[PDB]
Curated annotation (Swiss-Prot):
Organism: Cryphonectria parasitica
Keyword match Protease: yes
Official protein name in the record: Endothiapepsin
Gene name of the encoded protein: EAPA
Enzyme Commission number(s) of this protein: 3.4.23.22
Section of the entire sequence shown: 90 to 419 of 419
Keyword terms of this UniProt record: Aspartyl protease, Disulfide bond, Hydrolase, Protease, Signal, Zymogen
Enzyme class: hydrolase
Disulfide topology: C255-C290
Domain named Peptidase A1: residues: 17-328
UniProt GO MF annotations: aspartic-type endopeptidase activity
UniProt entry tagged with the keyword Disulfide bond: yes
GO BP, one annotated term: proteolysis
Residues at the catalytic site: D35, S199
């Protein structure tokens, strides 16, 4: 089997991407944030504290003839950005782009933190990291991909995120029309539960490539590119007037700037992030200070190849017995 679904930016900055997901019988379609940095499929629901719902579409398990309470199971998750959610668990039929999993754990939120409430466009998350990170207790549950994998034509999924435009998540096949050149594959460590890999270096603009190992995670659920402070300083030094602002929470730059590109290495291959992908717009409405899309990972504890990086590539998440990651230009 295979599946193919379009993923759409939630706003004009590509702050996140939403993908429609069918849950239950008859189908209830929710728009979920596919997150290769976590491993829980959770949704706003009829159980979510009413004051914490503001415009989201909810899953109502009592209206699904295939929903079953997973008795005694609870979940609770906290994300790197400080947001969180928790609740109980149902199993139900879940379909993405025509690919169906029966008995998928659907984690129903009883509580969500303010940032989730405040984002009316995201109805929940669909985790695509390794199932070892799943938070369900006392019986850990499998991700949608883990459940689907054996049925897929090939044990892979691909992320093809757009810059200020829709893109695609495919399951079970590699669309050879969706990228240019060849796909370069690179090793993955699953020891921390992530799609963790090592970039071979970077360049800023038309500058020379610096060969240096940068361990980090391929994370579709993180907006920006978080790299070591040395790398980030080297980038922003090429932008007149850019500075790190403790009050704003990162590097800012004059909105009048033309940003240089940023290149990262995948083995001997190179992925180029155009400068415009690094512009996250005014820090507040009407400001002439703009927020940067490359930020320091210092104090996160891990480097994160988030959407800023991934949207410059066609990315293969290869879930073979020994997982790997592939990157192609597009």
């Amino acid at each position: 089997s295979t599946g193919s679904a379009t993923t759409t930016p939630i706003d004009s900055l590509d702050d996140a991407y939403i993908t429609p997901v069918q849950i239950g019988t008859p189908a209830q379609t929710l728009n979920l944030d596919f997150d290769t940095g976590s491993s829980d499929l959770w949704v706003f629901s009829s159980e979510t504290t009413a004051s914490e719902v503001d415009g989201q579409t909810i899953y109502t398990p009592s209206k699904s003839t295939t929903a079953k309470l997973l008795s005694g199971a609870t979940w609770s998750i906290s994300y790197g950005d400080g947001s969180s959610s928790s609740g109980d668990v149902y199993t139900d039929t879940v379909s993405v782009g025509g690919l169906t999993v029966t008995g998928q754990a659907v984690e129903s939120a009883k509580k969500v933190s303010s940032s989730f409430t405040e984002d009316s466009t995201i109805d929940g998350l669909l985790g695509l990291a390794f199932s070892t990170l799943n938070t369900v207790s006392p019986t850990q549950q499998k991700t949608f991909f883990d459940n689907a994998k054996a049925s897929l034509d090939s044990p892979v999924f691909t992320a093809d995120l757009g810059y200020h435009a829709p893109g695609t998540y495919n399951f079970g096949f590699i669309d050879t029309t969706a990228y240019t050149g060849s796909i370069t594959y690179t090793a993955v460590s699953t020891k921390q539960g992530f799609w963790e890999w090592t970039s071979t270096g970077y360049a800023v603009g038309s500058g020379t490539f610096k060969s240096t190992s940068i361990d980090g995670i391929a994370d579709t659920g993180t907006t920006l590119l978080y790299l070591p402070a040395t790398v980030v300083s080297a980038y922003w030094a090429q932008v007149s007037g850019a500075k790190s602002s403790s009050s704003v929470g990162g590097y800012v730059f004059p909105c009048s700037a033309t940003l240089p590109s940023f290149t990262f290495g995948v083995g001997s291959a190179r992925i180029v992030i155009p400068g415009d992908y690094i512009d996250f717009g005014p820090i507040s409405t009407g400001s002439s200070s703009c927020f940067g899309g490359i930020q320091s990972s210092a104090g996160i504890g891990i480097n994160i190849f988030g959407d800023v990086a991934l949207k410059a590539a066609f990315v293969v998440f290869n879930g073979a017995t020994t997982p790997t990651l592939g990157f192609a230009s597009k």
